[PDB]
Amino acid sequence: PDIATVIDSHFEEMTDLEQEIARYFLQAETIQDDLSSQQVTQKLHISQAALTRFAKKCGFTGYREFIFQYQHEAENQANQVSKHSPLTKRVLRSYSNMREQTQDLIDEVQLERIAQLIEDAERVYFFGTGSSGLVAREMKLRFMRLGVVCEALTDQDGFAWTTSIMDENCLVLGFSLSGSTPSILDSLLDAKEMGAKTVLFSSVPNKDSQAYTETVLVATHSQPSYIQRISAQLPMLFFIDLIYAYFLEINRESKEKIFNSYWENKKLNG
Amino acid sequence: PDIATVIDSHFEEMTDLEQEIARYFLQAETIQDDLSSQQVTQKLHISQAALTRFAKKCGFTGYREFIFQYQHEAENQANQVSKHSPLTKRVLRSYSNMREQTQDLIDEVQLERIAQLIEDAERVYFFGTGSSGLVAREMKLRFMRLGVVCEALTDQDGFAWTTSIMDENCLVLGFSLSGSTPSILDSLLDAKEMGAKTVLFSSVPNKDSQAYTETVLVATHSQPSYIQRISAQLPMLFFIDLIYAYFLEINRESKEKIFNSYWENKKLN
DNA sequence: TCTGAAAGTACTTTTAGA
DNA sequence: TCTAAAAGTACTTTCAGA
Ligand SMILES: [Mg+2]
Ligand SMILES: [Mg+2]
């Protein structure tokens, strides 16, 4: 929490003097002042105990700890190259809000189970379109390095052909940020009718979306207008890296040897 | 710099007594002890002045600021939901850690100029390989919907062909997370010899090879071991979204008309 | 209850010795 | 130079008074 908001939240519970002491600290210039208790007491014409009491009601041990957070945020605000604009802050907000929204939707028992489904499957398949298609290509690169036999598909023709060759040892991961993409939903259903296990990634909850073996609910974008939203890959990439971390710990010793052999052949071929 | 390196960077010039104090605070478990001066004084058999002298040696006013800097970082370290597993915790930090670093690496006036560079450019190209290739394709999708004439390329055979058809009104953006990819660096130079403006995205700083119009510094992965690092697209994804935001407000109404036209005609009519 | 004033204290400064 | 101990202080705690 920004200290400007921390004083704001701890406002209506403060005494009249401290409510005025806050008003000085909410001022923008205040950071450039001498902020020692001796100076602040003379400038605001108060006692040093008043500063301690004001900091205590803000949730601090005393004025020394309060002024440290106040100065620490400013030094962290001044450690940047440029001072950021509302546009710069809005884009960073969408990343952090998605991180916190994803964090609220984390289903640990589901994620390991899906990671287990990848391990047990002989062949793993990735269906996506647009940005979701690029997400599918990312997981294909990441997991093939660990020894998973996998392929990625990105068009309707690719989905239909791959489904026709699936069996009970196949697994398909479907990506649909909107949750209503026609090619993703049908082909995943077509995969199920061939015995393949199916997992769907979406940001919308759907009652009939219980058809697939697993259904991972991902975060929704912070911006309301579509044109202003951040990268559409991010809602799934959070869960991509989670399932990857869980999947890596299953037979970690053997999987690392597969990774290092993959990395050796690539790096040494200069 | 975290509290770990400031003690690491501030070590060799410390006296023998304080160097023991350094390792005491550098050990992971010491966070849980009573970090008051007296308790630490009793544990280490030192003087309370020694703690103040040690803390000033780290660049602080005294022991009070050191502990608060020490304990606040742990408060920053464990303000997440304390229910998840260590696996879930590590991934969520690496996502945040990249965002913490990215915000500090932002050069707003540089990103604005790049956003202007794409608008003024008649043709824009995105070069990348592997994960960097996927980022290039992602950026191609976002800007094409706004009316930018662009193509994305992911192999060196594509890079060489494109460089032949480029001129002074072309602009190419190369993505190389390592900063030492031969195809990205060489083809970027071939673009400049054709008169086009060049922008390079890299996590390693390089003003030595300031041959490109702009060089954008992206965040580095929090995990030290390669196998455990999160998606490699994240350092690029932060800056492409920022550049997209600045570009969007340039002739916003006309950009929005094209964007709605894109979804109208390229979505089952 | 609430404020400043006085007494108290976790550290901070000064000091003397090795 | 370096340290602990002594001396000092920037707040912190205690507490009369309105
Ligand atoms: Mg003495
Ligand atoms: Mg004085």
Coordinates of C-alpha atoms (C1' of nucleotides) and ligand atoms in Angstrom, one line a residue:
Chain A
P1 CA 0.0 0.0 0.0
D2 CA 1.2 3.5 -0.9
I3 CA 1.9 5.6 2.2
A4 CA -0.3 8.3 0.7
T5 CA -3.2 5.8 0.8
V6 CA -2.0 4.4 4.2
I7 CA -2.5 7.8 5.9
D8 CA -5.8 8.2 4.0
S9 CA -7.1 4.8 5.3
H10 CA -5.9 5.7 8.8
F11 CA -7.6 9.1 8.8
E12 CA -11.1 9.1 10.4
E13 CA -9.6 7.5 13.5
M14 CA -7.1 10.2 14.2
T15 CA -7.3 13.2 16.6
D16 CA -7.8 16.7 15.3
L17 CA -4.1 17.6 15.7
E18 CA -3.0 14.4 13.9
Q19 CA -5.5 15.0 11.2
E20 CA -3.6 18.3 10.6
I21 CA -0.3 16.5 11.0
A22 CA -1.3 14.1 8.2
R23 CA -2.3 17.0 5.9
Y24 CA 1.3 18.2 6.0
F25 CA 2.6 14.7 5.1
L26 CA 0.0 14.3 2.3
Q27 CA 1.5 17.4 0.7
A28 CA 3.6 16.8 -2.4
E29 CA 6.6 19.0 -1.5
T30 CA 6.8 17.6 2.0
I31 CA 9.3 15.0 0.8
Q32 CA 11.8 17.8 0.1
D33 CA 11.7 19.2 3.6
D34 CA 13.8 18.4 6.6
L35 CA 11.7 15.6 8.2
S36 CA 13.4 15.2 11.5
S37 CA 11.1 15.3 14.6
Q38 CA 12.8 18.5 15.8
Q39 CA 12.2 20.3 12.5
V40 CA 8.6 19.0 12.0
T41 CA 7.6 20.0 15.5
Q42 CA 8.8 23.6 15.0
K43 CA 7.2 23.9 11.5
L44 CA 3.8 22.5 12.6
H45 CA 4.1 24.0 16.1
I46 CA 3.6 20.7 18.0
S47 CA 5.2 18.3 20.4
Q48 CA 7.5 15.4 19.5
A49 CA 5.0 13.1 21.3
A50 CA 2.3 14.2 18.7
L51 CA 4.4 12.8 15.9
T52 CA 4.9 9.5 17.7
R53 CA 1.1 9.3 18.4
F54 CA 0.3 10.1 14.7
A55 CA 2.6 7.4 13.5
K56 CA 1.2 4.9 16.0
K57 CA -2.4 5.3 14.7
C58 CA -1.0 4.8 11.2
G59 CA 0.2 1.3 12.2
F60 CA 3.8 2.1 13.0
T61 CA 6.0 1.6 16.1
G62 CA 6.8 5.3 16.1
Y63 CA 7.7 8.4 14.1
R64 CA 11.1 6.9 13.3
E65 CA 9.6 3.9 11.5
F66 CA 6.9 6.0 9.8
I67 CA 9.5 8.5 8.4
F68 CA 11.6 5.6 7.2
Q69 CA 8.7 4.2 5.0
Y70 CA 7.9 7.7 3.9
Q71 CA 11.5 8.3 2.8
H72 CA 12.0 4.7 1.5
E73 CA 9.1 5.0 -0.9
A74 CA 10.5 8.3 -2.2
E75 CA 14.0 6.8 -2.7
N76 CA 12.3 3.9 -4.5
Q77 CA 10.2 6.5 -6.4
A78 CA 13.5 8.3 -7.3
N79 CA 15.4 5.2 -8.2
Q80 CA 13.7 5.1 -11.6
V81 CA 15.0 6.7 -14.7
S82 CA 11.9 8.7 -15.6
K83 CA 9.0 9.6 -13.3
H84 CA 6.1 7.6 -14.7
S85 CA 3.0 9.0 -16.4
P86 CA -0.6 7.8 -15.8
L87 CA -0.2 5.7 -19.0
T88 CA 3.0 4.1 -17.6
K89 CA 1.3 3.4 -14.3
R90 CA -1.9 2.1 -15.9
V91 CA 0.0 -0.6 -17.9
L92 CA 1.9 -1.6 -14.8
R93 CA -1.3 -1.7 -12.9
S94 CA -2.8 -4.3 -15.3
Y95 CA 0.2 -6.6 -14.8
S96 CA 0.0 -6.4 -11.0
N97 CA -3.8 -6.6 -10.9
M98 CA -3.7 -9.7 -13.1
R99 CA -1.0 -11.2 -10.8
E100 CA -3.3 -10.6 -7.7
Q101 CA -6.4 -11.8 -9.5
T102 CA -4.6 -14.9 -10.8
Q103 CA -3.3 -15.5 -7.3
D104 CA -6.8 -15.6 -5.9
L105 CA -7.8 -18.2 -8.5
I106 CA -4.9 -20.7 -7.9
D107 CA -6.1 -24.3 -7.5
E108 CA -3.0 -26.1 -6.3
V109 CA -4.5 -29.6 -6.3
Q110 CA -5.8 -29.1 -9.9
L111 CA -2.5 -27.8 -11.2
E112 CA -0.4 -30.8 -10.0
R113 CA -3.2 -33.1 -11.3
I114 CA -2.9 -31.5 -14.7
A115 CA 0.9 -31.7 -14.4
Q116 CA 0.4 -35.4 -13.7
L117 CA -1.8 -35.7 -16.8
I118 CA 1.1 -34.4 -18.9
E119 CA 3.5 -36.9 -17.4
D120 CA 1.3 -40.0 -17.9
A121 CA 0.3 -39.0 -21.4
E122 CA 2.2 -40.4 -24.3
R123 CA 1.4 -37.5 -26.6
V124 CA 0.5 -34.0 -25.6
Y125 CA -1.3 -31.5 -27.8
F126 CA -1.8 -27.7 -27.7
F127 CA -4.7 -25.9 -29.3
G128 CA -4.9 -22.1 -29.6
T129 CA -5.7 -19.3 -31.9
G130 CA -4.2 -15.8 -32.2
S131 CA -2.5 -14.9 -29.0
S132 CA -3.7 -18.2 -27.5
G133 CA -1.9 -20.0 -30.5
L134 CA 1.3 -18.3 -29.5
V135 CA 0.8 -19.5 -25.9
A136 CA 0.4 -23.0 -27.3
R137 CA 3.7 -22.7 -29.2
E138 CA 5.4 -21.4 -26.0
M139 CA 4.3 -24.5 -24.0
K140 CA 5.4 -26.8 -26.8
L141 CA 8.9 -25.3 -26.7
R142 CA 9.1 -25.3 -22.9
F143 CA 7.9 -28.9 -22.4
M144 CA 9.6 -30.6 -25.3
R145 CA 12.9 -29.5 -23.7
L146 CA 11.9 -31.7 -20.7
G147 CA 11.2 -34.8 -22.9
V148 CA 7.4 -34.5 -23.5
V149 CA 6.4 -35.6 -27.0
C150 CA 4.1 -32.7 -28.0
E151 CA 2.9 -30.7 -31.0
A152 CA 1.1 -27.3 -31.3
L153 CA -1.8 -26.5 -33.6
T154 CA -3.1 -23.0 -34.5
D155 CA -5.8 -23.3 -37.2
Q156 CA -9.1 -25.1 -37.7
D157 CA -7.5 -27.5 -40.3
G158 CA -4.8 -28.4 -37.8
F159 CA -7.4 -29.1 -35.0
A160 CA -9.5 -31.5 -37.2
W161 CA -6.6 -33.5 -38.5
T162 CA -4.9 -34.1 -35.2
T163 CA -8.1 -35.1 -33.4
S164 CA -8.6 -37.9 -36.0
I165 CA -5.4 -39.6 -34.8
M166 CA -6.0 -39.4 -31.1
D167 CA -6.6 -42.2 -28.6
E168 CA -6.8 -42.8 -24.9
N169 CA -3.1 -42.0 -24.4
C170 CA -3.5 -38.4 -25.8
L171 CA -3.9 -35.1 -23.9
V172 CA -5.0 -31.8 -25.3
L173 CA -4.7 -28.4 -23.7
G174 CA -7.1 -25.8 -25.1
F175 CA -6.7 -22.1 -24.8
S176 CA -9.7 -19.7 -25.1
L177 CA -9.4 -16.4 -23.3
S178 CA -12.9 -15.4 -24.2
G179 CA -14.1 -19.0 -23.4
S180 CA -16.4 -19.0 -26.4
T181 CA -14.0 -19.6 -29.4
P182 CA -15.7 -22.0 -31.7
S183 CA -12.6 -23.9 -33.0
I184 CA -11.2 -24.4 -29.5
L185 CA -14.4 -25.7 -27.9
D186 CA -15.5 -28.1 -30.6
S187 CA -12.1 -29.7 -31.3
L188 CA -11.6 -30.2 -27.6
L189 CA -14.9 -32.0 -27.5
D190 CA -13.9 -34.0 -30.6
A191 CA -10.7 -35.0 -28.8
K192 CA -12.8 -36.3 -25.8
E193 CA -14.9 -38.5 -28.1
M194 CA -11.6 -40.0 -29.3
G195 CA -10.6 -40.9 -25.7
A196 CA -8.1 -38.1 -25.3
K197 CA -8.0 -36.2 -22.0
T198 CA -9.0 -32.6 -22.4
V199 CA -8.1 -29.4 -20.4
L200 CA -9.6 -26.0 -21.1
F201 CA -8.2 -22.6 -20.1
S202 CA -10.7 -19.7 -19.9
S203 CA -11.4 -16.5 -18.0
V204 CA -15.2 -17.0 -18.1
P205 CA -17.0 -19.6 -15.8
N206 CA -19.4 -21.9 -17.7
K207 CA -21.6 -24.6 -16.1
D208 CA -21.4 -26.9 -19.1
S209 CA -17.7 -26.5 -19.3
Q210 CA -17.4 -29.6 -17.1
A211 CA -17.2 -31.7 -20.3
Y212 CA -13.4 -31.4 -20.2
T213 CA -11.3 -33.4 -17.8
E214 CA -10.0 -30.1 -16.3
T215 CA -11.1 -26.5 -16.7
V216 CA -8.6 -23.9 -15.5
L217 CA -10.1 -20.5 -14.7
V218 CA -7.6 -17.7 -15.5
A219 CA -7.6 -14.1 -14.6
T220 CA -9.5 -11.4 -16.6
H221 CA -7.9 -8.3 -17.9
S222 CA -8.0 -5.1 -15.8
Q223 CA -8.9 -2.7 -18.6
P224 CA -12.6 -2.8 -19.6
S225 CA -12.1 -1.6 -23.2
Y226 CA -10.6 -4.4 -25.4
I227 CA -8.2 -2.1 -27.2
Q228 CA -6.6 -0.9 -24.0
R229 CA -6.0 -4.3 -22.4
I230 CA -2.5 -5.7 -22.0
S231 CA -1.2 -8.8 -23.7
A232 CA -3.8 -11.5 -24.0
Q233 CA -1.1 -14.2 -23.4
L234 CA -0.5 -13.2 -19.8
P235 CA -3.7 -14.7 -18.2
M236 CA -2.6 -18.2 -19.3
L237 CA 1.2 -17.7 -18.9
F238 CA 0.7 -17.4 -15.2
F239 CA -0.8 -20.9 -15.1
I240 CA 1.7 -22.0 -17.8
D241 CA 4.6 -21.4 -15.5
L242 CA 2.7 -22.8 -12.5
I243 CA 2.0 -26.1 -14.2
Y244 CA 5.5 -26.1 -15.6
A245 CA 7.0 -25.8 -12.1
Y246 CA 4.7 -28.6 -10.8
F247 CA 5.5 -30.8 -13.8
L248 CA 9.2 -30.3 -13.5
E249 CA 9.3 -31.7 -9.9
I250 CA 7.9 -35.0 -11.1
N251 CA 11.0 -37.1 -11.9
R252 CA 13.1 -34.0 -11.6
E253 CA 16.4 -35.9 -11.8
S254 CA 15.5 -37.6 -15.1
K255 CA 13.9 -34.5 -16.6
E256 CA 16.9 -32.3 -15.9
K257 CA 19.1 -34.7 -17.8
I258 CA 16.7 -34.4 -20.8
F259 CA 16.9 -30.6 -20.5
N260 CA 20.7 -30.5 -20.2
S261 CA 21.2 -32.8 -23.2
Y262 CA 18.8 -30.5 -25.2
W263 CA 20.7 -27.4 -24.1
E264 CA 24.1 -29.0 -24.8
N265 CA 23.3 -29.8 -28.5
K266 CA 22.0 -26.3 -29.1
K267 CA 24.7 -24.3 -27.4
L268 CA 27.7 -26.2 -28.7
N269 CA 26.4 -26.0 -32.3
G270 CA 27.7 -22.5 -32.7
Chain B
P1 CA 20.0 -3.8 -4.5
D2 CA 18.6 -6.2 -1.9
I3 CA 20.0 -6.4 1.6
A4 CA 22.1 -9.4 0.5
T5 CA 24.4 -7.7 -2.0
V6 CA 24.8 -4.4 0.0
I7 CA 26.4 -6.6 2.7
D8 CA 28.1 -8.5 0.0
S9 CA 29.3 -5.4 -1.7
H10 CA 30.1 -3.8 1.7
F11 CA 32.2 -6.6 3.2
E12 CA 35.9 -6.5 2.5
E13 CA 36.3 -3.0 4.1
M14 CA 34.6 -4.2 7.3
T15 CA 36.5 -4.9 10.5
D16 CA 36.8 -8.5 11.7
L17 CA 34.2 -8.1 14.4
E18 CA 31.6 -6.7 12.0
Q19 CA 32.3 -9.4 9.4
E20 CA 30.8 -11.9 11.9
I21 CA 27.9 -9.5 12.3
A22 CA 27.5 -9.5 8.5
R23 CA 27.2 -13.3 8.2
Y24 CA 24.8 -13.4 11.2
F25 CA 22.4 -11.2 9.3
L26 CA 23.2 -12.9 6.0
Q27 CA 22.0 -16.3 7.2
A28 CA 18.4 -17.0 6.2
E29 CA 17.0 -18.1 9.5
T30 CA 18.1 -15.0 11.5
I31 CA 15.0 -13.1 10.3
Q32 CA 12.9 -14.9 13.0
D33 CA 15.2 -13.9 16.0
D34 CA 14.5 -10.9 18.2
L35 CA 16.4 -8.3 16.2
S36 CA 16.5 -5.7 19.0
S37 CA 19.9 -4.3 19.8
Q38 CA 20.1 -6.0 23.2
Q39 CA 19.1 -9.4 22.0
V40 CA 21.5 -9.3 19.1
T41 CA 24.1 -7.9 21.5
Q42 CA 23.6 -10.9 23.9
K43 CA 23.7 -13.4 21.1
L44 CA 26.9 -12.1 19.4
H45 CA 28.6 -10.9 22.5
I46 CA 29.3 -7.5 21.1
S47 CA 28.7 -3.9 22.1
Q48 CA 25.5 -2.0 21.1
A49 CA 27.9 0.6 19.5
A50 CA 29.2 -2.2 17.3
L51 CA 25.8 -2.7 15.7
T52 CA 25.6 1.0 15.0
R53 CA 29.1 1.0 13.5
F54 CA 28.2 -2.1 11.4
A55 CA 25.0 -0.5 10.1
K56 CA 26.8 2.7 9.2
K57 CA 29.4 0.6 7.4
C58 CA 26.5 -0.6 5.2
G59 CA 25.5 3.0 4.4
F60 CA 22.8 3.6 6.9
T61 CA 22.3 6.2 9.6
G62 CA 22.3 3.5 12.3
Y63 CA 21.2 0.1 13.5
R64 CA 17.5 1.3 13.6
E65 CA 17.4 2.0 9.8
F66 CA 19.2 -1.3 9.0
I67 CA 16.7 -3.5 10.8
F68 CA 13.8 -1.6 9.4
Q69 CA 15.3 -2.0 5.9
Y70 CA 16.0 -5.6 6.8
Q71 CA 12.6 -6.4 8.2
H72 CA 10.6 -4.4 5.5
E73 CA 12.2 -6.5 2.7
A74 CA 11.1 -9.6 4.5
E75 CA 7.6 -8.0 4.8
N76 CA 7.9 -7.4 1.0
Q77 CA 9.1 -11.0 0.8
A78 CA 6.1 -12.6 2.5
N79 CA 3.1 -10.3 2.0
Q80 CA 1.5 -12.9 -0.4
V81 CA -1.1 -15.4 0.6
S82 CA 0.7 -17.6 3.2
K83 CA -1.3 -20.7 2.2
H84 CA 0.2 -21.8 -1.1
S85 CA 3.0 -24.2 -1.7
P86 CA 6.7 -23.2 -2.1
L87 CA 6.3 -24.0 -5.8
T88 CA 3.3 -21.6 -6.3
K89 CA 5.1 -19.0 -4.1
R90 CA 8.3 -19.1 -6.2
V91 CA 6.5 -18.6 -9.5
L92 CA 4.4 -15.7 -8.2
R93 CA 7.5 -13.9 -6.9
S94 CA 9.3 -14.3 -10.2
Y95 CA 6.4 -12.7 -12.0
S96 CA 6.4 -9.9 -9.4
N97 CA 10.2 -9.7 -9.3
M98 CA 10.3 -9.1 -13.0
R99 CA 7.6 -6.3 -12.6
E100 CA 9.6 -4.8 -9.8
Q101 CA 12.7 -4.6 -12.0
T102 CA 10.8 -3.6 -15.1
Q103 CA 9.3 -0.5 -13.4
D104 CA 12.9 0.6 -12.4
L105 CA 14.2 0.1 -16.0
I106 CA 11.5 2.2 -17.7
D107 CA 12.7 5.1 -19.8
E108 CA 9.4 6.8 -20.6
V109 CA 10.7 9.3 -23.0
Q110 CA 12.4 6.5 -25.0
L111 CA 9.3 4.5 -25.2
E112 CA 7.3 7.5 -26.4
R113 CA 9.8 8.1 -29.2
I114 CA 9.6 4.5 -30.3
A115 CA 5.8 4.7 -30.3
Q116 CA 6.3 7.8 -32.5
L117 CA 8.8 5.9 -34.7
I118 CA 6.3 3.1 -35.5
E119 CA 3.6 5.7 -36.4
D120 CA 5.9 7.7 -38.7
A121 CA 7.4 4.5 -40.2
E122 CA 5.7 3.3 -43.4
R123 CA 6.8 -0.3 -42.9
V124 CA 7.6 -2.0 -39.5
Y125 CA 9.2 -5.4 -39.0
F126 CA 9.7 -7.5 -35.9
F127 CA 12.7 -9.9 -35.7
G128 CA 13.0 -12.6 -33.1
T129 CA 14.0 -16.2 -32.5
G130 CA 12.5 -18.8 -30.2
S131 CA 10.5 -17.1 -27.4
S132 CA 11.7 -13.7 -28.9
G133 CA 10.1 -14.9 -32.1
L134 CA 6.8 -15.4 -30.4
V135 CA 7.0 -11.9 -28.9
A136 CA 7.6 -10.5 -32.4
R137 CA 4.5 -12.3 -33.6
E138 CA 2.5 -11.0 -30.6
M139 CA 3.5 -7.4 -31.4
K140 CA 2.7 -7.9 -35.0
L141 CA -0.9 -8.9 -34.1
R142 CA -1.5 -5.9 -31.8
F143 CA -0.2 -3.2 -34.2
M144 CA -1.7 -4.7 -37.4
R145 CA -5.1 -4.3 -35.8
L146 CA -4.4 -0.6 -35.4
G147 CA -3.5 -0.1 -39.1
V148 CA 0.3 -0.6 -38.9
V149 CA 1.7 -2.3 -42.0
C150 CA 4.0 -5.0 -40.5
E151 CA 5.4 -8.5 -40.8
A152 CA 6.9 -10.7 -38.2
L153 CA 9.9 -13.0 -38.8
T154 CA 11.3 -15.9 -36.8
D155 CA 14.3 -17.3 -38.8
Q156 CA 17.5 -16.0 -40.3
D157 CA 16.4 -17.0 -43.8
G158 CA 13.4 -14.7 -43.3
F159 CA 15.7 -12.0 -41.8
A160 CA 18.0 -11.9 -44.9
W161 CA 15.2 -11.7 -47.4
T162 CA 13.5 -8.9 -45.5
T163 CA 16.7 -6.9 -45.3
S164 CA 16.9 -6.8 -49.1
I165 CA 13.5 -5.1 -49.5
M166 CA 14.0 -2.4 -46.9
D167 CA 14.8 1.3 -47.3
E168 CA 15.0 4.6 -45.4
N169 CA 11.3 4.5 -44.5
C170 CA 11.4 1.1 -42.9
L171 CA 11.7 0.3 -39.2
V172 CA 12.8 -3.1 -37.7
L173 CA 12.7 -4.2 -34.0
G174 CA 14.9 -7.0 -33.0
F175 CA 14.3 -9.1 -29.9
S176 CA 17.3 -10.9 -28.2
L177 CA 16.9 -11.6 -24.5
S178 CA 20.5 -12.9 -24.3
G179 CA 21.8 -10.0 -26.3
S180 CA 24.3 -12.2 -28.1
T181 CA 22.1 -13.9 -30.7
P182 CA 24.1 -13.8 -34.0
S183 CA 21.1 -13.7 -36.4
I184 CA 19.4 -10.9 -34.6
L185 CA 22.5 -8.7 -34.2
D186 CA 23.8 -9.3 -37.8
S187 CA 20.5 -8.8 -39.5
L188 CA 19.8 -5.7 -37.5
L189 CA 23.1 -4.2 -38.8
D190 CA 22.1 -5.3 -42.3
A191 CA 18.9 -3.3 -41.8
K192 CA 20.8 -0.2 -40.9
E193 CA 23.0 -0.4 -44.0
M194 CA 19.7 -0.4 -45.9
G195 CA 18.9 3.0 -44.3
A196 CA 16.2 1.7 -41.9
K197 CA 15.9 2.7 -38.2
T198 CA 16.8 -0.1 -35.8
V199 CA 15.6 -0.8 -32.2
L200 CA 17.0 -3.7 -30.1
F201 CA 15.5 -5.2 -27.0
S202 CA 18.0 -6.9 -24.7
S203 CA 18.5 -7.7 -21.1
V204 CA 22.2 -7.1 -21.2
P205 CA 23.3 -3.5 -21.5
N206 CA 25.3 -2.5 -24.5
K207 CA 26.3 1.0 -25.4
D208 CA 29.5 -0.3 -27.0
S209 CA 27.3 -1.5 -29.9
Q210 CA 25.3 1.7 -29.9
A211 CA 24.7 1.2 -33.7
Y212 CA 21.0 1.0 -33.4
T213 CA 18.6 4.0 -33.2
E214 CA 17.4 2.9 -29.7
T215 CA 18.4 0.1 -27.3
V216 CA 15.8 -0.9 -24.8
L217 CA 16.9 -2.5 -21.5
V218 CA 14.4 -5.3 -20.4
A219 CA 14.2 -7.1 -17.1
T220 CA 16.2 -10.2 -16.3
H221 CA 14.8 -13.5 -15.0
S222 CA 14.6 -13.8 -11.2
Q223 CA 15.5 -17.5 -11.2
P224 CA 19.3 -18.1 -11.5
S225 CA 19.0 -21.6 -12.8
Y226 CA 17.7 -21.7 -16.4
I227 CA 15.4 -24.7 -16.0
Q228 CA 13.4 -22.9 -13.3
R229 CA 13.0 -19.5 -15.0
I230 CA 9.5 -18.3 -15.9
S231 CA 8.3 -17.6 -19.5
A232 CA 11.0 -15.8 -21.5
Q233 CA 8.4 -13.6 -23.2
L234 CA 7.8 -11.6 -20.0
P235 CA 10.7 -9.1 -20.2
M236 CA 9.6 -8.2 -23.8
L237 CA 5.9 -8.4 -23.0
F238 CA 6.1 -5.5 -20.5
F239 CA 7.7 -3.1 -23.0
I240 CA 5.6 -4.0 -26.0
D241 CA 2.5 -3.3 -23.9
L242 CA 3.9 0.0 -22.8
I243 CA 4.9 1.0 -26.4
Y244 CA 1.4 -0.1 -27.5
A245 CA -0.2 2.2 -24.9
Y246 CA 1.8 5.2 -26.0
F247 CA 1.2 4.4 -29.7
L248 CA -2.5 4.0 -29.1
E249 CA -3.0 7.6 -28.0
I250 CA -1.4 8.9 -31.2
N251 CA -4.5 9.7 -33.3
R252 CA -6.6 7.6 -31.0
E253 CA -9.9 8.0 -32.8
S254 CA -8.5 6.9 -36.2
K255 CA -6.7 3.9 -34.5
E256 CA -10.0 2.9 -32.8
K257 CA -11.9 3.0 -36.2
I258 CA -9.4 0.6 -37.7
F259 CA -9.4 -1.7 -34.6
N260 CA -13.2 -2.0 -34.7
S261 CA -13.0 -2.5 -38.5
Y262 CA -10.5 -5.4 -37.8
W263 CA -12.9 -7.2 -35.5
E264 CA -15.9 -6.5 -37.8
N265 CA -14.5 -8.0 -41.0
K266 CA -12.0 -10.5 -39.5
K267 CA -14.6 -12.3 -37.3
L268 CA -17.2 -14.2 -39.3
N269 CA -18.2 -10.9 -40.8
Chain C
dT1 C1' -10.1 11.9 25.8
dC2 C1' -6.2 14.5 24.5
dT3 C1' -2.2 17.4 24.5
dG4 C1' 2.4 18.8 25.9
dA5 C1' 5.9 18.2 29.5
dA6 C1' 8.9 15.4 32.0
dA7 C1' 11.0 11.1 32.7
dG8 C1' 12.7 7.2 30.3
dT9 C1' 15.3 4.5 26.6
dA10 C1' 16.9 1.9 22.4
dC11 C1' 20.4 3.3 20.2
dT12 C1' 23.8 6.9 18.8
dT13 C1' 28.2 9.7 19.9
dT14 C1' 32.1 10.7 22.4
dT15 C1' 35.9 9.1 24.8
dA16 C1' 40.0 6.7 26.5
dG17 C1' 42.9 2.7 26.1
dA18 C1' 45.1 -1.1 23.6
Chain D
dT1 C1' 42.7 2.1 13.7
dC2 C1' 39.6 -0.2 16.6
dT3 C1' 36.8 -1.4 20.4
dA4 C1' 33.8 -1.2 24.6
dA5 C1' 32.2 2.0 28.0
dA6 C1' 30.8 6.2 29.1
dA7 C1' 28.1 10.0 27.9
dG8 C1' 24.6 11.7 25.0
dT9 C1' 20.1 12.0 22.3
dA10 C1' 16.2 11.5 19.0
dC11 C1' 12.5 10.0 19.8
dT12 C1' 9.4 6.9 23.0
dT13 C1' 6.9 6.2 27.1
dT14 C1' 4.7 8.1 31.1
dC15 C1' 1.4 11.5 33.1
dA16 C1' -0.4 15.7 35.0
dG17 C1' -3.7 19.2 33.4
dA18 C1' -7.5 21.2 30.7
Ligands
MG1 MG 36.5 4.5 28.2
MG2 MG 22.2 18.3 19.9

